[PDB]
Every structure is written in structure tokens, then in C-alpha cells.
Design a binder for this molecule. Structure first.
Ligand SMILES: [Zn+2]
Length: 325
């Protein structure tokens, strides 16, 4: 059996766990970290936010099984048990549980987050990233965490509150048929806050229908893009690129790099009788495969883009293992 071409049995419901595991399994820097045993020296056994390493260890054993080449499929049962103890969208919980089980910080310091105070974006963003790293420093931060900018303007006191905040994936609103760029553009478009989600202005201590505008500051080696289809489901066809997604026009950081991305995995959802599956590119032969619980089959790029596409995993070209741009 070819390593990585390994299915996952359906324990029973479990939402898109298998689909998510297949996307994470075919995230090369993450799988390489576990197969090379780099996680043992970084297991955090005394983290009040973690599982005493049990999520990272069960995930590591699962990954090792899937890339041993001994199995056509395996059961992710132990890993599911640990994830369910961590958390009574699943992807945020998976990345958070791995992160805290591997957090290189032993005791998180309390950090006061200053408002921009009219300082330049670069200063404020580097401060925010340094503070983040003072509390969160792991392989998960290294692969998946980026930084975005939030600008809130008070309709009452005109206070301009600017913050930079970490993300481990981007939830995109959906603009019939649309392109991915249109969804990102809409994600960065200034909206007014509704009465269903006001903002607490700290200057007059009232909740406000503030304007909110998001901007992208820095992008991770692996950019995970969640298309917001739930909250019934929007079946919009979102056209996205397989290769050469250029994010540079959306970044406001002038010191970001080339930021070109190639698709590596897609979580699909059908008929929400809802069911999730995955397309993923195998790191050893570079071909595309379709993962449906225990079933693995060959796929071609021309079926990847569909109304079913739900979560997209992109890897930045300059971070590719073994090739230098
Ligand atoms: Zn105010």
C-alpha cells in the first residue's frame, strides 16, 4: 500500500472529522513533523489548556499508521476519544488541541493588548505577533497562524479602535456563481455592525453599531480557507484556483513575501443526509485522490471545484519541502 493512501473508517457520525484528518494528513509540514518524531521533545504535559499531550500523541500514532503503507484504512478511534475530551467548527478545535499539546511556552504570561494609539500598522502588528508568540509558540503556529487587522469606528464617539489578531484559518463570506477572489474581497469590505453583533466601545462603555473592516496583514505557510456555507446551507458554486493563487493584492503589509499558493486539499460537504469527504494531493507522487471514509480513489484536478467544496487548504510556494523558489 502506498503511504498516505489510507482511508478512515466511519465510527458513527463524527461530522467532518475524517475529512479534516485527511486534509491535515496531506499537509506536508505537519505530517513530516510527526513522522520524523519531532513532537516528543515538544509535548506539553502541564498545560491547563491542553490534554497533557494525549491529543498530539494519539494524532501522531494515527499519522504514523496512515503513512506506514501497511493499511488500506485505519480507525481514528483513540484520536476521536481524545478530541472529544478536549471539546464536548471542529477544525478550530483540532488545531487548538494540537497547538496546546505542543506549545513550547510552559506558563503563558498575562499580556495587556494596547490599542494602536495612532502608531503605525507595522509597529502595532509586530507587537501583536510578538505578544502572540509569547503565549503561543508551536508547530501549529508555525504552519497555520497568520495575522489580520480589525478597524472598528464608533458611530457615537468616533474612536478608531485598531487591533491585530491571530488566525488559524480564514472564514470567507460568499458573494449563483462567484470566484474565490470575490469572497476574499467581500471579507475585506467595510460593513456596519448589526444589532445582533454590536461592539463594546471602551470610550463610552456602550454597545455600538460600529463599522468594522478587516484586512490581511500576514499569511501562514498553510492557508486554510473556510467557505461560510452554514449560517440552511448556501450551495453557491465558488470557483477557486488549483495552482498559483496570488494573495499579494489583498495584503496590506508591504514586507510580506511573494505569497503565491497552490491547493493541497479540499474538504467537501454533500446534501446537508449530510456527508463530508476530501480531495487531497499526495506529497509523494503529486497526484490527486478522493478520500471517502475508508475508500480512497484516484481523482483529477478538473473535478475538485464543485458546489460541495467547503474548506480549502493552500500551501505557500516558498514553503514547499524540497524546492526553492
Ligand atoms: Zn465610543
Amino acid at each position: 500500500e502506498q503511504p498516505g493512501l489510507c482511508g478512515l473508517s466511519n465510527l458513527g457520525n463524527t461530522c467532518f472529522m475524517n475529512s479534516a484528518i485527511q486534509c491535515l494528513s496531506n499537509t506536508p509540514p505537519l505530517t513530516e513533523y510527526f513522522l520524523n518524531d519531532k513532537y516528543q521533545e515538544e509535548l506539553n504535559f502541564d498545560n491547563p489548556l491542553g490534554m497533557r499531550g494525549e491529543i498530539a500523541k494519539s494524532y501522531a500514532e494515527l499519522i504514523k499508521q496512515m503513512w506506514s503503507g501497511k493499511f488500506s484504512y485505519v480507525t481514528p478511534r483513540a484520536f476521536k476519544t481524545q478530541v472529544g475530551r478536549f471539546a464536548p467548527e471542529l477544525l478550530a478545535f483540532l488545531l487548538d488541541g494540537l497547538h496546546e499539546d505542543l506549545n513550547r511556552i510552559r506558563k503563558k504570561p498575562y499580556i495587556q493588548l494596547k490599542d494602536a494609539d495612532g502608531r503605525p500598522d507595522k509597529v502595532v502588528a509586530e507587537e501583536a505577533w510578538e505578544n502572540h508568540l509569547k503565549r503561543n509558540d508551536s508547530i501549529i503556529v508555525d504552519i497555520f497562524h497568520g495575522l489580520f487587522k480589525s478597524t472598528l469606528v464608533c458611530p457615537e464617539c468616533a474612536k478608531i479602535s485598531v487591533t491585530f489578531d491571530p488566525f488559524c484559518y480564514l472564514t470567507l463570506p460568499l458573494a449563483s456563481k462567484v470566484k474565490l477572489k470575490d469572497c476574499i474581497e467581500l471579507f475585506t469590505t467595510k460593513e456596519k455592525l448589526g444589532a445582533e453583533d454590536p461592539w463594546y466601545c471602551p470610550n463610552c462603555k456602550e454597545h455600538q453599531q460600529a463599522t468594522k473592516k478587516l484586512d490581511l496583514w500576514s499569511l501562514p505557510p498553510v492557508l486554510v480557507v473556510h467557505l461560510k456555507r452554514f449560517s440552511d446551507k448556501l450551495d453557491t458554486l465558488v470557483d477557486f484556483p488549483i495552482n498559483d493563487l496570488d494573495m499579494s493584492e489583498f495584503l496590506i503589509n508591504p514586507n510580506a513575501g511573494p505569497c503565491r499558493y497552490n491547493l493541497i486539499a479540499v474538504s467537501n460537504h454533500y446534501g446537508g443526509g449530510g456527508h463530508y469527504t476530501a480531495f487531497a494531493k499526495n506529497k509523494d507522487d503529486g497526484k490527486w485522490y478522493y478520500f471517502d471514509d475508508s475508500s480512497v480513489s484516484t481523482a483529477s484536478e478538473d473535478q475538485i471545484v464543485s458546489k460541495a467544496a467547503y474548506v480549502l487548504f493552500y500551501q505557500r510556494q516558498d514553503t514547499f519541502s524540497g524546492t526553492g523558489f
